[PDB]
Amino acid sequence: HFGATGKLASADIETYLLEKSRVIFQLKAERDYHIFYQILSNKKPELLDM
Amino acid sequence: FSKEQQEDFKEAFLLFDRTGECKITLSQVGDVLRALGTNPTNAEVKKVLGNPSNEEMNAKKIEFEQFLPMMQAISNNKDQGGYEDFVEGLRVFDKEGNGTVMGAELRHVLATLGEKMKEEEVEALLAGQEDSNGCINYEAFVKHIMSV
Amino acid sequence: KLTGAIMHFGNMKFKLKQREEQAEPDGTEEADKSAYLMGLNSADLLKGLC
Amino acid sequence: DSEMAVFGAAAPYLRKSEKERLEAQTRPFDLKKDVFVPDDKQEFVKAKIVSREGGKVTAETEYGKTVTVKEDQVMQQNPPKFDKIEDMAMLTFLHEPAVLYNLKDRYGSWMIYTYSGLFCVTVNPYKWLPVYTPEVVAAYRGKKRSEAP
Amino acid sequence: LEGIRICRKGFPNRILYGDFRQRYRILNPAAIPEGQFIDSRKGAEKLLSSLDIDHNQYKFGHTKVFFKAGLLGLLEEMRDERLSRIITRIQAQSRGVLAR
Ligand SMILES: CC(C)n1c(=O)cc(N[C@@H](C)c2ccccc2)[nH]c1=O
């Protein structure tokens, strides 16, 4: 969204259909959502403790 | 022009020349011809000169007798824009449509986007012409600058 | 001029779209006559009205 | 092109080089003979007309294979002056192989974006072009589709 | 392919007569003199006829003007060339009277 002057004023995100089943089932040659492996890959001690 | 026109043109150069009789301002003379006659785009001045160097613009001083023809040549570039031509210009900067232009983007437009201008002039041209809300009545600004 | 525009303003003819049930001007000559008097624009006047 | 300098290091990955401009005027191409012909392993292949036999035509493909197809299924090749144009709506001959090969010649040179008139086609590079860092954003500010690649 | 077929043959570009007049009046203020009434249809007719572009590229609708595929880009190129010309010529005036 932009103002009458044209400068950025806000942004709205809308989502339509998350593949909620992908969270539990994936075929060969594909991943689940990236969040899980990116958290696990750094083994960041503060997150690996939390 | 009349023979009495060239004399009063001459004494503009005679006041601007700080030399007792060998100067006329190669860097500043075209800027003054705006006042004595009509006003060009500086690029057209540079095209009649034939695109000199910036160091030439800062160091060179030219000879007046060759400049008398330049007075007419710089006067020659017709199809200058009229009042309606100018007033429809700043409306594209007007993102409201009511007849005001905010000076925060008006000075920005005049400084950044067209030909170069000496910025202090941009500060002082609109100074005193603003309103309390911080805008300009550009149809007045155009009928100001076309007249005087 | 404002009295005159209130006269012209009744001469604006509107027509329903074949499926949207939305008003669009057929009588654009009366709407641009009105806007010319009130100092609006024919398009944004018609868009605002409809 | 001297104006390409505004994109910095991203410039080679958006528009063809000056050599490709000069090569285009020197390519061997005959508008009446150069045509696309369908193939099995690949949808279309360039081919060269060798003879005319009324309603039946015979031609030799770029791989030296002989083919015979009726004139209803043969499509003239686009001249090299329109190769890799940035907007496929400006193609002179528009058909399935003209778009296929217009995408293929651009994509093989990592020029991944191409317009198609009112809409645009982007082909997945799979390897990065430094075409997404802050410096190009400034080059795209206020520029129109006629100006920027 | 079909979308190109329609873009090349058809009239993909379209403007309301009022927004056309409002935006591109900067292209020829004399074709649409203000201070006097002129219907949206005949005004757009005179302005576009004055542009000297290929007249086979457009046709007029009941409420929108219609252009061939490649015209609208050329009109925006034309308008920004004019806006550059004019903001520099208003600067011609600004410098001229400021120097006065
Ligand atoms: C059909 C569509 C592509 N279109 C146009 O063809 C022109 C529009 N508006 C005009 C006023 C305009 C032209 C060019 C740039 C900005 C705006 N709107 C539109 O929706």
Swiss-Prot record, chain A:
Q: What else is known?
A: The cardiac alpha isoform is a 'fast' ATPase myosin, while the beta isoform is a 'slow' ATPase.
Q: Can you tell me which family this protein belongs to?
A: Belongs to the TRAFAC class myosin-kinesin ATPase superfamily. Myosin family.
Tell me the function of this protein.
Answer: Myosins are actin-based motor molecules with ATPase activity essential for muscle contraction. Forms regular bipolar thick filaments that, together with actin thin filaments, constitute the fundamental contractile unit of skeletal and cardiac muscle.
**Can you quote the domain comment?**
The rodlike tail sequence is highly repetitive, showing cycles of a 28-residue repeat pattern composed of 4 heptapeptides, characteristic for alpha-helical coiled coils.
Indicate the quaternary assembly: Muscle myosin is a hexameric protein that consists of 2 heavy chain subunits (MHC), 2 alkali light chain subunits (MLC) and 2 regulatory light chain subunits (MLC-2). Interacts with ECPAS. Interacts (via C-terminus) with LRRC39.
The identity of this protein, by name, is Myosin-7
In the complete protein, the residues contained here run 251 to 300 of 1935
From Swiss-Prot, chain B:
Residues bearing PTM Phosphothreonine = 25, 41
Subunit-structure text: Myosin is a hexamer of 2 heavy chains and 4 light chains. Does not bind calcium.
Report any one BP term from Gene Ontology: muscle contraction
Q: Which UniProt keywords apply?
A: Acetylation, Methylation, Motor protein, Muscle protein, Myosin, Phosphoprotein, Repeat
Q: What is this protein called?
A: Myosin light chain 1/3, skeletal muscle isoform
Cellular component (GO) terms are:
myofibril; myosin complex
Q: Which GO terms describe its molecular function?
A: calcium ion binding; structural constituent of muscle
EF-hand domain: which residues? 4-39, 81-116, 116-148
Q: What does this protein do?
A: Non-regulatory myosin light chain required for proper formation and/or maintenance of myofibers, and thus appropriate muscle function.
Question: From which residue to which, out of the full length, is covered?
Answer: 41 to 188 of 188
Source domain of life is Eukaryota
Q: Which residues cross the membrane?
A: none
PTM Phosphoserine: list the residues.
27, 53
Q: Which organism is it from?
A: Mus musculus (Mouse)
Q: How is it modified after translation?
A: Isoform MLC3 is acetylated at position 2.
Statement: the UniProt record of this protein carries the keyword Phosphoprotein: yes
From Swiss-Prot, chain D:
Task: Cite the effect that the entry attributes to residue 24 to V.
Answer: In CMH1; benign
Listed result of changing residue 113 to H: In CMH1; uncertain significance
Where does the Myosin N-terminal SH3-like domain start and stop, copy by copy? 30-79
Modification type N6,N6,N6-trimethyllysine: residues:
127
Q: Which domain of life is it from?
A: Eukaryota
Q: Where in the cell is it found?
A: Cytoplasm, Myofibril; Cytoplasm, Myofibril, Sarcomere
Q: What residue stretch is flagged as signal peptide?
A: none
Q: Which disease is it linked to?
A: Cardiomyopathy, familial hypertrophic, 1: A hereditary heart disorder characterized by ventricular hypertrophy, which is usually asymmetric and often involves the interventricular septum. The symptoms include dyspnea, syncope, collapse, palpitations, and chest pain. They can be readily provoked by exercise. The disorder has inter- and intrafamilial variability ranging from benign to malignant forms with high risk of cardiac failure and sudden cardiac death. Congenital myopathy 7A, myosin storage, autosomal dominant: A skeletal muscle disorder characterized by prominent axial and proximal weakening, spinal stiffness, severe scoliosis, with or without respiratory and cardiac involvement. The age at symptom onset can range from early childhood to late adulthood, and disease severity ranges from asymptomatic to severe muscular weakness and respiratory insufficiency. Histopathological examination shows variable findings including subsarcolemmal hyaline bodies in type 1 fibers.
What else the UniProt entry mentions is: The cardiac alpha isoform is a 'fast' ATPase myosin, while the beta isoform is a 'slow' ATPase.
Task of the protein: Myosins are actin-based motor molecules with ATPase activity essential for muscle contraction. Forms regular bipolar thick filaments that, together with actin thin filaments, constitute the fundamental contractile unit of skeletal and cardiac muscle.
What family is this protein classified in?
Belongs to the TRAFAC class myosin-kinesin ATPase superfamily. Myosin family.
Q: What is this protein called?
A: Myosin-7
Supply the source organism for this entry.
Homo sapiens (Human)
Q: Which residues of the full protein are shown?
A: 3 to 151 of 1935
